[PDB]
Symmetry: C3
Amino acid sequence: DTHALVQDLETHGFDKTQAETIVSALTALSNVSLDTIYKEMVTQAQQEITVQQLMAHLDAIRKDMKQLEWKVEELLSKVYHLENEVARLKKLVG
Amino acid sequence: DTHALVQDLETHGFDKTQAETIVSALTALSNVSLDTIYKEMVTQAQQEITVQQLMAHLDAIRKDMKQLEWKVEELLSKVYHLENEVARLKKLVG
Amino acid sequence: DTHALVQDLETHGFDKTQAETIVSALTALSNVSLDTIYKEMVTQAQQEITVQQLMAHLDAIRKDMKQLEWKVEELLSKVYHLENEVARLKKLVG
């Protein structure tokens, strides 16, 4: 912050005006630089949103896979029951 | 950029040489610090490439999931058809 | 880093104390800015770790996918074999 920096310069061989204008210049470049960085780079907030979205895709796929697994298990049981019926039929006619 | 900053210092109790050397120091640190940031941090253009790659992986898995779903559906239709055939056969053999 | 900057100021119309306090101010703002940037933005090192974690989730899903594929193959074989048995049975009774 401004005070303790302007305060420091004044008490180490600078004027009021010299210390404030120096600090005005430091702030000026700081703020334009940060502004350029925040625009060009990826913020942690943007990253968090992207990651949540990718985890939402992964969760939807996992959910589908579970459902398909359950549907294959049901088909397997029905196939089992038909195998028994068919084996029984073969015996009757055979 | 340089001008209005050196201009400001000179007109607030600094020399030509004092204002330029100050500004030379600000530039020096700004430029090395930015250079270190632009190298160490992720740009939007790099993010986009990474995200697209992750979305391509997710799309391939979704596409494999769809094909497997279709293949289970086919199996389902065949099992249904065998259920009906077997029920018909049981009827014939009395 | 500090030296050649304090050295430059002194030799261009500044004191020992004036040159060091200026440089102390440049360091102060540099370091708070960088600290704010490192907290708010995504580094390449962070990105690599996040990407590896997402790829570990994708690899777990691809692994589960293979096991479900195997299970569909086992259903398919059983369904195919029942189709043949049934086709044969229909001929015998038909």
